[PDB]
Amino acid sequence: KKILIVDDEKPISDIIKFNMTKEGYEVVTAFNGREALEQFEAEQPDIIILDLMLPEIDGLEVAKTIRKTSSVPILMLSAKDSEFDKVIGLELGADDYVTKPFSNRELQARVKALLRRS
Amino acid sequence: KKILIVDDEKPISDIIKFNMTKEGYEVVTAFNGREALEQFEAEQPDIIILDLMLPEIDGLEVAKTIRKTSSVPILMLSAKDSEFDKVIGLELGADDYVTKPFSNRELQARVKALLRRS
Ligand SMILES: [Mg+2]
Numbered sequence: 001k002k003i004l005i006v007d008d009e010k011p012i013s014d015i016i017k018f019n020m021t022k023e024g025y026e027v028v029t030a031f032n033g034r035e036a037l038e039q040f041e042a043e044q045p046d047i048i049i050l051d052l053m054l055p056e057i058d059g060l061e062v063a064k065t066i067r068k069t070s071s072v073p074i075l076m077l078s079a080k081d082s083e084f085d086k087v088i089g090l091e092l093g094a095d096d097y098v099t100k101p102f103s104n105r106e107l108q109a110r111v112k113a114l115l116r117r118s
Numbered sequence: 119k120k121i122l123i124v125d126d127e128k129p130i131s132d133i134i135k136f137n138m139t140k141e142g143y144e145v146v147t148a149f150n151g152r153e154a155l156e157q158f159e160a161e162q163p164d165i166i167i168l169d170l171m172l173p174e175i176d177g178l179e180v181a182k183t184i185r186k187t188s189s190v191p192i193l194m195l196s197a198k199d200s201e202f203d204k205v206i207g208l209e210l211g212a213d214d215y216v217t218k219p220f221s222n223r224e225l226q227a228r229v230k231a232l233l234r235r236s
């Protein structure tokens with residue numbers, strides 16, 4: 001399976017990439033909203049882990065435009081952990097919303113749960 | 119022309135109703151998100167003035183669901199006046215975003231501007 005990780009922090013992106021690779025996923029990466037959209041169209045990932053906060057396009061905006069054409073599962077990841085953040089991510093199309101810092105094992109479990117249902 | 123005013127404060131709703139009536143619009147009112155959606159389907163207004171903050175459904179959620187079926191112009195009205203509020207209202211489908219308190223004459227000008235282009 002192919003995962004697109006859209007994250008503007010190279011350290012966090014690498015931790016997720018390393019852990020998804022170890023689980024046997026193919027990983028493509030993007031570091032802003034524009035790259036996320038390009039990688040999305042070109043690579044057709046099975047799932048996208050999307051930071052809400054990105055340099056070019058926000059995460060909310062990326063997920064909005066994705067949902068125009070695609071039902072690809074989106075797992076939103078963010079340091080913002082209030083009700084309003086989670087609810088607005090889910091309502092703008094996230095299938096799930098996990099907060100940072102996260103548990104590596106939980107992330108993996110949640111990715112598998114999204115792919116199981118999809 | 120018919121305006122639906124979705125506002126949970128009966129005092130503000132009345133001021134907008136009074137002023138739109140004086141301009142020759144037919145007015146229907148709604149005081150929460152559920153009533154907005156019901157009035158929307160039943161009355162088919164030409165334009166909707168929508169408070170962002172409502173008891174049942176938020177304004178963002180109402181405008182989201184409206185846009186599923188309809189291109190009816192939406193003018194979002196709110197006490198929240200930050201960039202993030204305006205931008206997220208516009209991006210969730212508002213044609214315009216005016217802040218409270220507002221100028222009666224400006225509201226009217228902006229309503230006419232939305233109807234002119236529509
Ligand atoms: Mg990345």
Ligand SMILES: [Mg+2]
Nearest residue numbers: 123125131148
């Ligand atoms: Mg009202």
Ligand SMILES: [Xe]
Nearest residue numbers: 060061064209
């Ligand atoms: Xe957005």
Ligand SMILES: [Xe]
Nearest residue numbers: 091178179182
């Ligand atoms: Xe929303």
